[PDB]
Amino acid sequence: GPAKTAPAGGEVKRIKLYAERLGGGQMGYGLEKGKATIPGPLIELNEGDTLHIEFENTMDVPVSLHVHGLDYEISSDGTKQSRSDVEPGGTRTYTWRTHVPGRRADGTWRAGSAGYWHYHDHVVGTEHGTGGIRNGLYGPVIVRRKGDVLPDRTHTIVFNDMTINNRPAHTGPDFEATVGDRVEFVMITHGEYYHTFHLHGHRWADNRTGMLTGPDDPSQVIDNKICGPADSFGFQVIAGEGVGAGAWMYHCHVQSHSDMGMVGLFLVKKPDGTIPGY
Amino acid sequence: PAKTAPAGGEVKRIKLYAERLGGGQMGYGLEKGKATIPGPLIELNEGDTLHIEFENTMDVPVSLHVHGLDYEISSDGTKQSRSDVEPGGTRTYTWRTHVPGRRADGTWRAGSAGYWHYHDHVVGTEHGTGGIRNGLYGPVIVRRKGDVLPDRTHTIVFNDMTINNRPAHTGPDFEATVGDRVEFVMITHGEYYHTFHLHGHRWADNRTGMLTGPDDPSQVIDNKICGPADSFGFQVIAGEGVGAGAWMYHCHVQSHSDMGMVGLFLVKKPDGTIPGY
Amino acid sequence: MGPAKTAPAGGEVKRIKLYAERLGGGQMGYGLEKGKATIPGPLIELNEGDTLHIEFENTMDVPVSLHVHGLDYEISSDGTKQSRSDVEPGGTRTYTWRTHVPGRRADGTWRAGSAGYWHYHDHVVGTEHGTGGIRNGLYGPVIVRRKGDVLPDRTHTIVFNDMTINNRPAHTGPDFEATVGDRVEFVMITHGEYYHTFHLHGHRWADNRTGMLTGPDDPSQVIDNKICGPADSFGFQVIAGEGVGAGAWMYHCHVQSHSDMGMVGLFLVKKPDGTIPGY
Numbered sequence: 001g002p003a004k005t006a007p008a009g010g011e012v013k014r015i016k017l018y019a020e021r022l023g024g025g026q027m028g029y030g031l032e033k034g035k036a037t038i039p040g041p042l043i044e045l046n047e048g049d050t051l052h053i054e055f056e057n058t059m060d061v062p063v064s065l066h067v068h069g070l071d072y073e074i075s076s077d078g079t080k081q082s083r084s085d086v087e088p089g090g091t092r093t094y095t096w097r098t099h100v101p102g103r104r105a106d107g108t109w110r111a112g113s114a115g116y117w118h119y120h121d122h123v124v125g126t127e128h129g130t131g132g133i134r135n136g137l138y139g140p141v142i143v144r145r146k147g148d149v150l151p152d153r154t155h156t157i158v159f160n161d162m163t164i165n166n167r168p169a170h171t172g173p174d175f176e177a178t179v180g181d182r183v184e185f186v187m188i189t190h191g192e193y194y195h196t197f198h199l200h201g202h203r204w205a206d207n208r209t210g211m212l213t214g215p216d217d218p219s220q221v222i223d224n225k226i227c228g229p230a231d232s233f234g235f236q237v238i239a240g241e242g243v244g245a246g247a248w249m250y251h252c253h254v255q256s257h258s259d260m261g262m263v264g265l266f267l268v269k270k271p272d273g274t275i276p277g278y
Numbered sequence: 279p280a281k282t283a284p285a286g287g288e289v290k291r292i293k294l295y296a297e298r299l300g301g302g303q304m305g306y307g308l309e310k311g312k313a314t315i316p317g318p319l320i321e322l323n324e325g326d327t328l329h330i331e332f333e334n335t336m337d338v339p340v341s342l343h344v345h346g347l348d349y350e351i352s353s354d355g356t357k358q359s360r361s362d363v364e365p366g367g368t369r370t371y372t373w374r375t376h377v378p379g380r381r382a383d384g385t386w387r388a389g390s391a392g393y394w395h396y397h398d399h400v401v402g403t404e405h406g407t408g409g410i411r412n413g414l415y416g417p418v419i420v421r422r423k424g425d426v427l428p429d430r431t432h433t434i435v436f437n438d439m440t441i442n443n444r445p446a447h448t449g450p451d452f453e454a455t456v457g458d459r460v461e462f463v464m465i466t467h468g469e470y471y472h473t474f475h476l477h478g479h480r481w482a483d484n485r486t487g488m489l490t491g492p493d494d495p496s497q498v499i500d501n502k503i504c505g506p507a508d509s510f511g512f513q514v515i516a517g518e519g520v521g522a523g524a525w526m527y528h529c530h531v532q533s534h535s536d537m538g539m540v541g542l543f544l545v546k547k548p549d550g551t552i553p554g555y
Numbered sequence: 556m557g558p559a560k561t562a563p564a565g566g567e568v569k570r571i572k573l574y575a576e577r578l579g580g581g582q583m584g585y586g587l588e589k590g591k592a593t594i595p596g597p598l599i600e601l602n603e604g605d606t607l608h609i610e611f612e613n614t615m616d617v618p619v620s621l622h623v624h625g626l627d628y629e630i631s632s633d634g635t636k637q638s639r640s641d642v643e644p645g646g647t648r649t650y651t652w653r654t655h656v657p658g659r660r661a662d663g664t665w666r667a668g669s670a671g672y673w674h675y676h677d678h679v680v681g682t683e684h685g686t687g688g689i690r691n692g693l694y695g696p697v698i699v700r701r702k703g704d705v706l707p708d709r710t711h712t713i714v715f716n717d718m719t720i721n722n723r724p725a726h727t728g729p730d731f732e733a734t735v736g737d738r739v740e741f742v743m744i745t746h747g748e749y750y751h752t753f754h755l756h757g758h759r760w761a762d763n764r765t766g767m768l769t770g771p772d773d774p775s776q777v778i779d780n781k782i783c784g785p786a787d788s789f790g791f792q793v794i795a796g797e798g799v800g801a802g803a804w805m806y807h808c809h810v811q812s813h814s815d816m817g818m819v820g821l822f823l824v825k826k827p828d829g830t831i832p833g834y
C-alpha cells in the first residue's frame with residue numbers, strides 16, 4: 001500500500017558501543033564485544049532523538065568517536081584537544097543530540113539534523129584519526145525527519161582510500177533485493193582520494209533524501225556522483241524499477257579504480273529468486 | 279518566444295557504428311566512415327523509446343553503455359551481462375525513458391530528463407578504460423515536456439587531460455551571436471578530477487542549468503568540480519550582460535589549463551565582428 | 556536575538572582602488588592602499604544592481620591582471636592577456652564590474668541574478684592562466700547580495716590554496732573568534748592543483764546559494780563537509796555554537812594527509828564571559 005514514514009522523534013535512546021581490534025591490523029566498532037564490523041553498526045535516529053553512547057575502548061591504544069552533522073557538545077567532539085578520546089581499556093559516555101527545523105527568533109529557518117551522516121575515529125595514529133580511519137573505524141548514521149519515507153532495507157557503501165569497506169579488491173560487497181523493493185543506500189568516503197560513485201540501471205535525486213520532493217524540486221537527477229574524504233550522502237531506489245531484474249554494477253568510476261577492483265553488485269532478483277544472465 | 283520540448287512517447291530508431299579513427303582512436307558514428315569524437319548527440323523526449331541498431335566495425339569487441347535512462351540488463355552493454363558486441367557483430371540496444379509521476383506508494387518518481395552520456399564498457403578492460411580513452415563517448419539529452427529549447431548545442435568532454443580528445447591548445451571553439459540561446463553538455467571521463475569554468479557567463483547548478491523561477495534556491499556558478507563519468511549541462515544567453523568577445527572556457531585546475539585544456543566560446547556582434555580578436 | 560538585518564536593494568555606482576604588491580617571500584597580494592596588501596585580498600561586497608569601478612595599479616616587476624568570477628564584465632575587464640585587459644608593470648587600468656537583479660526575460664525564462672559567493676584573482680602571472688599569481692597569493696573574496704539576504708555579524712574568508720590556507724605556514728590557522736550566538740559568515744574559495752573537502756566541527760549549513768535553507772520547501776542537502784576544486788567558491792552562515800555551545804571548534808580539510816600536514820584552523824566560540832571551555 002502507501003509508503004511507510006518516520007514517526008516524530010524526541011525519545012532519549014541508549015546503546016553500548018565498543019572499539020576493538022580485528023584481524024590483520026584492522027579496527028572496527030561493534031554493539032557487543034567480539035561483534036565489531038567494518039563498517040560499524042548503523043545508527044538511526046528521528047529528529048529530536050537524543051542518543052547516549054556507552055563507549056568502551058577495548059584496544060591497547062587511545063581511540064575516539066566523532067560524528068558528523070549531529071548536535072554534540074565539545075566534550076563529545078571525540079578529539080585529543082577536547083580531551084574527549086578514550087584511553088585503553090577505558091569507557092566514556094558520548095552524547096549525540098538531534099533537532100527539528102523551525103523559525104529562529106531572527107526570522108530565519110534553522111535546518112534540522114536530518115540526513116545521511118557518519119561517525120569515525122579522530123585519534124588513532126594522528127590527531128585526525130588517519131590510522132584509525134585507515135584501519136576501519138567508521139560507520140553510518142541516519143537521522144530521519146518526521147514523514148521521511150522508510151525503506152525495505154539499508155546498505156552502506158564506504159569508499160575508504162582504494163577499498164570498499166576495507167574489503168580486498170574485487171570482493172564486493174554485494175547486496176541482494178527483489179524487483180520492486182525500496183532500497184536505501186548510504187555512501188560515505190574516507191581517506192586520501194576523490195572518487196565518483198556510480199550505479200547501473202538506477203538513478204536518484206541529488207538532495208537531502210536522495211528522492212524528489214514532488215514536481216517542483218529542481219535537484220539534478222544523477223547516476224554518478226563525485227565524492228571525497230568525509231563526504232556522505234544517501235538515497236532510495238525501487239529495485240529494478242523500469243529496468244528489470246539483473247546483476248547491477250556499482251563501482252567507483254575513476255577508471256584505474258574500477259579497473260583495480262572497486263566494484264560491487266546490486267543483485268536484483270525476479271519474484272521467484274532467479275537473476276537473469278547470472 | 280522560447281520554444282519548448284513537446285511531450286514524448288514516440289518509438290524511435292537509429293543506426294550506430296563503432297569504428298577506428300586515426301591515431302589509435304575509436305568513435306561512434308551515425309554512418310560508416312562518419313564517426314566522431316564525441317559521438318553523435320542523441321536527443322529524446324520523456325516517454326520516448328529508442329531502438330539503436332548497432333554494428334561494431336572494429337576488429338576488437340566494443341559496447342554501448344548509457345547513463346540515467348531506462349535499459350534492461352540486456353542493454354547494459356557489458357561483458358558481465360553478455361551485452362557487448364563482437365568484432366563485425368551487430369546488436370539492437372534499447373533505451374527507454376519515462377516522465378515523472380506519482381507511484382502507487384504515493385512517493386514521487388523522478389523522470390528521465392537530464393544531461394546524460396554513452397560510452398564503451400569493454401575496450402581494454404571491463405570498465406572500458408581503453409575505449410573511453412580512445413574516444414568512444416557521446417552526449418545524451420532527455421527533455422521534459424516544457425523544457426526550453428536552445429538555438430544550438432555544444433558538447434565539451436574533459437577526457438583525461440584532453441578536451442574531446444584534441445591535442446593541447448586545439449580547442450574546440452564554438453561560435454555564437456550575442457543573444458543566442460546556447461546549450462552546453464559537460465561530460466568528464468578518465469582518470470582525473472577537473473573543474474569546468476566559463477568566462478563571462480553563469481548557470482544554475484540543477485537539472486536544467488537554469489533557475490526555474492524566483493523560488494529556486496540552486497546555487498548560481500561559473501565553476502564546477504567534476505569526476506569521471508560526471509554529466510551536467512546548462513544554457514546561457516550569449517553575451518548576456520557582458521557583450522561580445524572571445525570568452526574563455528577551460529579546466530580551472532591550474533596545471534591542466536597550462537597544459538592546454540582550454541577553448542573559446544566565440545560570441546560575435548551582429549555584424550560578425552569580435553572585439554579583441 | 557532580534558529580527559536579522561537584511562541587504563537593501565542595489566543600483567549604486569561604487570568606487571575603490573586596488574593595488575598589486577609584492578610581499579615577503581615571493582608572495583604577491585592585492586591591497587586597497589599602497590603598502591596595505593593582504594592575502595587573501597580585501598573583501599568586496601556589492602548589492603545586486605551595484606556597479607563597481609576598480610582603479611587598479613600594478614606596482615610589480617611583471618604584468619598582473621584582475622579577473623573576477625560570476626559578475627558582469629565586458630571583455631575589456633576580462634583580465635587576460637588575450638583580451639589585452641592585463642596591466643603592465645607600473646601601469647594602471649580601471650576594471651569595471653557590474654551586477655544585475657534576477658528577472659523575467661522577454662522569452663518567458665527566468666534570468667538568474669548576480670548574487671552569490673564569488674572571487675577575483677590574477678590571470679596573468681607566471682602563466683597565462685595566472686598559476687603564479689595565484690600561488691603567490693593574488694586572490695580575494697567577492698560577495699554579491701540579493702535584496703533581503705540575511706546579513707552576518709562578522710565575515711571570514713577561508714581559502715584553500717594548493718596545500719595552504721590563505722598561503723600560511725602549515726599549522727598556523729587562521730583562527731576566527733566568535734561569541735556563542737553570533738551570526739557568522741564563511742566564504743570558502745579553493746585554488747591551485749588539488750581537490751579538497753572543507754569540514755567544520757559542531758556546525759552545519761545548506762548546500763545552496765546562501766548556505767542557509769530558504770524555508771521548509773528547500774530540498775538542499777544539509778552538510779558539514781564539502782568537496783571543492785580549484786576556483787570553486789561557496790559561502791554560508793551559522794549561529795555560533797548553536798545547539799552545541801562554546802568550544803574551540805575545528806575546521807579543516809578532511810583529506811587525511813592534508814589535515815595531518817596542517818590545513819587546520821579553529822572557530823573559537825566564546826561564552827558571554829569570554830572563556831572557552833577546556834582550551
Ligand SMILES: COc1cc(C(C)=O)ccc1O
Binds near residue numbers: 437438439444446
Ligand atoms: C593528447 O595528447 C596527450 C594527452 C595525454 C593525456 C590526456 O593524459 C597524455 C599524453 C598525450 O600525448
Ligand SMILES: [Cu+2]
Binds near residue numbers: 122128756805807
Ligand atoms: Cu576533524
Ligand SMILES: [Cu+2]
Binds near residue numbers: 159194196253262
Ligand atoms: Cu575511486
Ligand SMILES: [Cu+2]
Binds near residue numbers: 199200344
Ligand atoms: Cu553506468
Ligand SMILES: [Cu+2]
Binds near residue numbers: 066068120230809
Ligand atoms: Cu570527520
Ligand SMILES: [Cu+2]
Binds near residue numbers: 200249251399
Ligand atoms: Cu559501469
Ligand SMILES: [Cu+2]
Binds near residue numbers: 470472473539
Ligand atoms: Cu582538469
Ligand SMILES: [Cu+2]
Binds near residue numbers: 478622624
Ligand atoms: Cu573566470
Ligand SMILES: [Cu+2]
Binds near residue numbers: 253343345397507
Ligand atoms: Cu559509465
Ligand SMILES: [Cu+2]
Binds near residue numbers: 477526528678684
Ligand atoms: Cu580563465
Ligand SMILES: [Cu+2]
Binds near residue numbers: 752808809813814818
Ligand atoms: Cu585538502
Ligand SMILES: [Cu+2]
Binds near residue numbers: 068757
Ligand atoms: Cu565533525
Ligand SMILES: [Cu+2]
Binds near residue numbers: 530624786
Ligand atoms: Cu578563475
